[PDB]
């Protein structure tokens, strides 16, 4: 399925993911598109930070859900 | 130098490491003590997951720092 990620400039990118993808897998997909290493990425959904070991479906992330990318400072 | 690792039960072990040790090397040292293969280990420090190709030095991990071992499980 497709999900969206709001990037550091507020532009939206589109990823192909599965409900069983872990957040660590999703951060690797974001690294491919944005060039930010996973250990520098905070991923936010519904106003909370996601943990690396959970799946997208563990957070009830759906088709065409939007995640937010934040850079670790 | 000495660092600590909190294991899957919350017990702490000690590792002998150098600041130049990679995280992949540290996972191999954890395998020797805990019997968990490196590809099944998530190593956490300061609330974030460490990447294999970085050194302890790259995360400013110092003597007596405590890392957290988590088992790779979806969920």
Residue numbers in the entry:
A (entry chain A): 1 to 73
B (entry chain B): 1 to 75
Publication passage describing the model:
The Papain-like protease (PLpro) is a domain of a multi-functional, non-structural protein 3 of coronaviruses. PLpro cleaves viral polyproteins and posttranslational conjugates with poly-ubiquitin and protective ISG15, composed of two ubiquitin-like (UBL) domains. PolyUb and ISG15 have common other structural features: ISG15 comprises two Ub-like (UBL) domains and mimics a head-to-tail linked di-ubiquitin (Ub2). While K48-linked Ub2 (K48-Ub2) and ISG15 are similar both in sequence and fold, the topologies of how the two domains are linked are distinct.
We additionally determined structures of the free hISG15 and K48-Ub2 to 2.15 and 1.25 Å resolution, respectively. An analogous comparison of our unbound K48-Ub2 structure with the only known PLpro-bound conformation of K48-Ub2 (from SARS-CoV-1)28 revealed an rmsd of 10.2 Å. The Ub units are oriented very differently relative to each other, with the PLpro-bound Ub2 in an extended conformation (like hISG15) while the unbound Ub2 in an open conformation with the functional hydrophobic surface patches exposed for binding. In the open conformation, the functional binding surface on Ub is exposed, while in the closed conformation, the functional nonpolar surfaces are engaged in intramolecular Ub-Ub interactions (arrow). Moreover, different Ub linkage types may exploit different interdomain conformational spaces explaining the source of specificity.
